[PDB]
Amino acid sequence: RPNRLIVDEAINEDNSVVSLSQPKMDELQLFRGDTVLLKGKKRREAVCIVLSDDTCSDEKIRMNRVVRNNLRVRLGDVISIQPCPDVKYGKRIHVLPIDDTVEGITGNLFEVYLKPYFLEAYRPIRKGDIFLVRGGMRAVEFKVVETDPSPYCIVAPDTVIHCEGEPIKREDEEESLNEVGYDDIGGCRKQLAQIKEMVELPLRHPALFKAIGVKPPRGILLYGPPGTGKT
Amino acid sequence: RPNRLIVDEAINEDNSVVSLSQPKMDELQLFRGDTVLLKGKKRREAVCIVLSDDTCSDEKIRMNRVVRNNLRVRLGDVISIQPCPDVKYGKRIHVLPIDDTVEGITGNLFEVYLKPYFLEAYRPIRKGDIFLVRGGMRAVEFKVVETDPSPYCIVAPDTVIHCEGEPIKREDEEESLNEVGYDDIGGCRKQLAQIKEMVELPLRHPALFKAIGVKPPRGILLYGPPGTGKTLIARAVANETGAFFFLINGPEIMSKLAGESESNLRKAFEEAEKNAPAIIFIDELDAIAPKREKTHGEVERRIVSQLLTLMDGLKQRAHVIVMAATNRPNSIDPALRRFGRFDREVDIGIPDATGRLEILQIHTKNMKLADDVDLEQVANETHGHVGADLAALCSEAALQAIRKKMDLITIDAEVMNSLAVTMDDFRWALSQSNPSALRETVVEVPQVTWEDIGGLEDVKRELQELVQYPVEHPDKFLKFGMTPSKGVLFYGPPGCGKTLLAKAIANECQANFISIKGPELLTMWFGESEANVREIFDKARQAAPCVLFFDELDSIAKARGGGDGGGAADRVINQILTEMDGMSTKKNVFIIGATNRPDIIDPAILRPGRLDQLIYIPLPDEKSRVAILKANLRKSPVAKDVDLEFLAKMTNGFSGADLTEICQRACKLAIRESIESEIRRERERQTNPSEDDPVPEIRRDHFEEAMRFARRSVSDNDIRKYEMFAQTLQQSRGFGSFRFP
Numbered sequence: 020r021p022n023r024l025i026v027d028e029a030i031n032e033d034n035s036v037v038s039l040s041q042p043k044m045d046e047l048q049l050f051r052g053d054t055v056l057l058k059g060k061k062r063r064e065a066v067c068i069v070l071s072d073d074t075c076s077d078e079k080i081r082m083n084r085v086v087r088n089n090l091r092v093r094l095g096d097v098i099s100i101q102p103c104p105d106v107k108y109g110k111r112i113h114v115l116p117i118d119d120t121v122e123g124i125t126g127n128l129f130e131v132y133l134k135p136y137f138l139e140a141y142r143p144i145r146k147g148d149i150f151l152v153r154g155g156m157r158a159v160e161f162k163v164v165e166t167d168p169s170p171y172c173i174v175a176p177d178t179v180i181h182c183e184g185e186p187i188k189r190e191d192e193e194e195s196l197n198e199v200g201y202d203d204i205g206g207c208r209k210q211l212a213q214i215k216e217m218v219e220l221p222l223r224h225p226a227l228f229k230a231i232g233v234k235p236p237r238g239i240l241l242y243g244p245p246g247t248g249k250t
Numbered sequence: 251r252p253n254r255l256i257v258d259e260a261i262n263e264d265n266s267v268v269s270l271s272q273p274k275m276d277e278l279q280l281f282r283g284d285t286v287l288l289k290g291k292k293r294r295e296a297v298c299i300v301l302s303d304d305t306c307s308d309e310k311i312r313m314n315r316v317v318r319n320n321l322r323v324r325l326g327d328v329i330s331i332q333p334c335p336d337v338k339y340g341k342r343i344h345v346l347p348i349d350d351t352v353e354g355i356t357g358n359l360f361e362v363y364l365k366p367y368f369l370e371a372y373r374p375i376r377k378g379d380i381f382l383v384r385g386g387m388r389a390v391e392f393k394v395v396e397t398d399p400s401p402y403c404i405v406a407p408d409t410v411i412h413c414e415g416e417p418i419k420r421e422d423e424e425e426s427l428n429e430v431g432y433d434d435i436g437g438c439r440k441q442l443a444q445i446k447e448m449v450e451l452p453l454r455h456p457a458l459f460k461a462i463g464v465k466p467p468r469g470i471l472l473y474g475p476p477g478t479g480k481t482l483i484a485r486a487v488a489n490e491t492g493a494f495f496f497l498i499n500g501p502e503i504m505s506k507l508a509g510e511s512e513s514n515l516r517k518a519f520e521e522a523e524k525n526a527p528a529i530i531f532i533d534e535l536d537a538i539a540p541k542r543e544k545t546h547g548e549v550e551r552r553i554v555s556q557l558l559t560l561m562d563g564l565k566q567r568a569h570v571i572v573m574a575a576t577n578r579p580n581s582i583d584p585a586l587r588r589f590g591r592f593d594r595e596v597d598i599g600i601p602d603a604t605g606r607l608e609i610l611q612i613h614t615k616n617m618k619l620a621d622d623v624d625l626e627q628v629a630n631e632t633h634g635h636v637g638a639d640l641a642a643l644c645s646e647a648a649l650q651a652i653r654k655k656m657d658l659i660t661i662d663a664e665v666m667n668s669l670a671v672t673m674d675d676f677r678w679a680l681s682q683s684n685p686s687a688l689r690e691t692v693v694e695v696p697q698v699t700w701e702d703i704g705g706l707e708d709v710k711r712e713l714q715e716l717v718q719y720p721v722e723h724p725d726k727f728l729k730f731g732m733t734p735s736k737g738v739l740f741y742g743p744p745g746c747g748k749t750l751l752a753k754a755i756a757n758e759c760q761a762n763f764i765s766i767k768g769p770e771l772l773t774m775w776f777g778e779s780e781a782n783v784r785e786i787f788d789k790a791r792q793a794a795p796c797v798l799f800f801d802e803l804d805s806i807a808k809a810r811g812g813g814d815g816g817g818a819a820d821r822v823i824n825q826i827l828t829e830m831d832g833m834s835t836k837k838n839v840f841i842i843g844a845t846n847r848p849d850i851i852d853p854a855i856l857r858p859g860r861l862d863q864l865i866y867i868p869l870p871d872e873k874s875r876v877a878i879l880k881a882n883l884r885k886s887p888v889a890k891d892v893d894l895e896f897l898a899k900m901t902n903g904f905s906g907a908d909l910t911e912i913c914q915r916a917c918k919l920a921i922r923e924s925i926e927s928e929i930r931r932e933r934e935r936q937t938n939p940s941e942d943d944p945v946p947e948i949r950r951d952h953f954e955e956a957m958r959f960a961r962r963s964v965s966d967n968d969i970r971k972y973e974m975f976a977q978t979l980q981q982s983r984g985f986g987s988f989r990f991p
Binding site (some may be wrong): 025078128216220225227228231232233234 | 388648656666
């Protein structure tokens with residue numbers, strides 16, 4: 020099924036843009052825009068803007084950690100990619116910051132964070148999604164609790180944003196974006212790739228490794244001067 | 251009784267083939283491929299196919315582990331063999347897999363496992379037989395529930411197999427095929443044979459040993475670098491002899507509280523006593539009983555003393571053999587190497603190319619491999635691998651193949667059987683593999699042969715008389731009053747094949763070859779670690795018959811000035827002399843020294859009882875040069891139009907190193923031309939997107955160009971010096987006119 024694409028790390032840092040390989044969007048009938056509704060592994064649907072890049076493999080879809088989290092998928096998982104041209108310019112979207120990422124923050128969060136975000140770019144939004152905004156040398160994750168053309172919309176320049184205190188407690192299923200990820204690591208791309216090749220198959224497919232008769236790696240020894248982020 | 255035959259290890263891995271010796275094959279009118287019935291130890295009959303081989307001994311029958319298991323017999327047991335021409339081509343066969351061998355696999359086993367089996371080959375089948383099928387890199391054993399012409403049947407290609415799933419839980423008295431055996435061990439054929447001859451008789455015939463009353467081997471120390479499967483060797487020996495196997499892990503014992511370690515050791519020895527005959531394997535003995543200086547604590551010394559006490563009390567214990575593993579003999583307390591303790595010693599060491607090939611076959615046995623794979627090449631390239639390194643390499647190749655296959659896809663056995671590892675995967679693993687024994691001393695029979703040098707017939711004769719005759723005809727040396735010469739000294743221009751000659755003589759005698767290069771002697775000299783010389787000889791003695799080669803004995807003399815004002819004596823060469831004097835001629839350890847500066851060699855080494863013979867290895871002659879060129883180009887594709895004889899004739903005065911340089915330069919030119927032409931072709935395709943190898947072989951032009959860089963590293967002055975040395979040695983031989991009256 021062409022709609023099935025394997026998740027992979029993203030190059031572009033936009034938390035609403037997914038990238039595909041050149042022989043794919045045409046095959047899937049998509050363009051540099053063409054908001055697409057990807058399907059998650061927990062009945063989670065995320066609408067994001069499509070893009071392209073040469074380095075991306077034919078069967079790989081590059082997505083950032085935010086989309087991965089709100090889709091409840093991890094690297095190497097397979098997601099359904101299907102065009103979503105039936106997108107409406109929602110007028111009022113009610114969002115809410117998560118309490119865990121706003122402690123000690125005061126001021127108009129919308130102006131501080133949601134204003135530079137959701138502006139100068141027709142970002143797609145899906146109800147119940149979590150989107151991260153980096154500003155003021157902080158990172159705040161906002162949960163979209165309601166959109167007027169439910170469950171998905173596009174934030175137009177005239178679109179209205181709603182929020183009134185009452186920070187929402189993160190649910191158990193959601194994983195904090197501050198949790199470490201491959202995007203939080205730099206300077207060891209080669210070594211990180213080596214470790215990934217070592218451990219992904221044993222960890223991502225434990226039942227296969229138990230049923231199969233190959234020897235998994237047991238002890239990996241990362242060395243180097245302290246402060247290189249081995250932990 | 252002719253029917254009685256002694257079970258023996260099999261060379262062909264087929265569950266329905268048993269090999270017989272030619273005389274006994276004809277004695278019992280056993281025809282090739284004829285069905286034969288074997289009677290087990292406990293009324294366990296099995297039908298197999300007779301094969302013929304020369305290596306098989308008359309009174310022994312070569313049989314694999316599957317047949318042995320369904321016969322309930324072990325190596326060295328006696329079974330009755332009878333021809334069974336009265337075979338029936340049974341149609342309906344009911345078989346069922348054992349659960350523990352299919353724990354994880356899914357899909358129709360028959361379509362993926364039993365379909366290749368029983369196909370294109372008539373496999374005799376008997377009810378109750380458990381037979382192993384190796385596929386999908388997972389070996390699965392099936393138990394024959396029943397057959398139509400019970401109990402004996404043949405699975406003809408038109409037969410029918412009925413399977414109802416429901417894997418059978420294995421019952422008692424049936425040892426699992428995954429249990430280690432001699433077929434699961436590779437790279438230690440000599441050491442495994444030594445351990446077998448050590449322990450089989452005490453273990454297989456405990457009463458015959460206690461009643462008879464001789465000293466059994468109570469302590470065996472298998473030392474060698476980690477990863478050589480020493481625990482595997484011990485477990486296989488225990489399983490094949492039927493002896494109870496108790497494993498003591500050094501770290502596990504030392505991980506317990508004080509008192510708990512002593513209790514655990516005592517309980518292990520008591521359990522071994524209870525289940526005698528038994529083997530107690532102490533893995534990582536150095537963990538328990540390191541050198542007395544490395545055991546600071548008092549509890550550690552108490553544990554070592556407790557182990558010594560248990561080893562000494564073994565005498566009261568009956569038919570209990572204790573095996574221990576260590577990296578080196580010096581890693582453990584010397585008190586453990588006394589008599590009544592780990593006095594027997596075996597050196598597993600690094601596997602050789604043949605050993606590495608055996609290991610690769612063992613590990614790549616269930617693996618489905620592509621046709622392009624040649625494990626011989628991998629074994630050749632896997633220098634410095636110990637066997638755990640080879641297992642890791644095979645696993646890495648399998649994992650890379652799994653990645654390359656499943657990237658586009660509780661497992662499909664059909665997929666795994668379809669999955670195949672290619673030489674590309676193995677070469678990638680080789681690149682990504684880090685051998686654990688790269689700097690371990692190499693002790694192996696060299697693959698060099700006299701043809702690689704193809705010259706110096708007199709030198710061949712001298713080397714034969716000095717190495718081959720002592721080991722091949724000890725009776726002749728005893729008959730006359732001659733003691734074999736301890737060693738010889740090669741001297742001559744650099745790169746003239748002294749190492750080649752030493753390796754060739756070692757190969758001819760099938761003796762181990764140890765090379766001690768000049769950098770090693772200089773490392774001992776600079777570090778003042780001349781004591782290591784002992785180890786070297788200890789290695790050679792452990793590998794006798796062995797050729798101990800010192801590539802540059804004059805390296806230290808050169809390092810001090812061809813001088814520094816002192817005498818020719820130095821610490822390292824002094825230790826070499828000391829070890830040579832303390833070398834028993836009964837051991838067939840032959841010392842060969844090589845030098846380009848015979849003048850500066852310490853005279854003490856050129857004495858009777860030492861490297862007394864001096865052999866001049868001159869620059870290769872025309873025939874030797876042709877042989878050297880052929881040997882260098884053996885691995886290279888060379889166009890037939892090149893006349894290596896003409897090249898040898900025109901390259902007079904060249905050392906073997908010079909000819910190797912010419913050949914390598916020709917290969918360089920050929921490779922450069924190949925790469926340039928490939929770049930040209932791909933560029934032409936890019937510009938003209940609208941094939942054959944331009945240079946499949948090294949042509950004449952390549953050699954002609956390489957000869958323009960040809961060098962003569964040995965000047966006529968150096969040849970003059972060496973010839974003057976030889977003439978000085980030969981002119982003193984002025985008593986040839988002597989004749990009796």
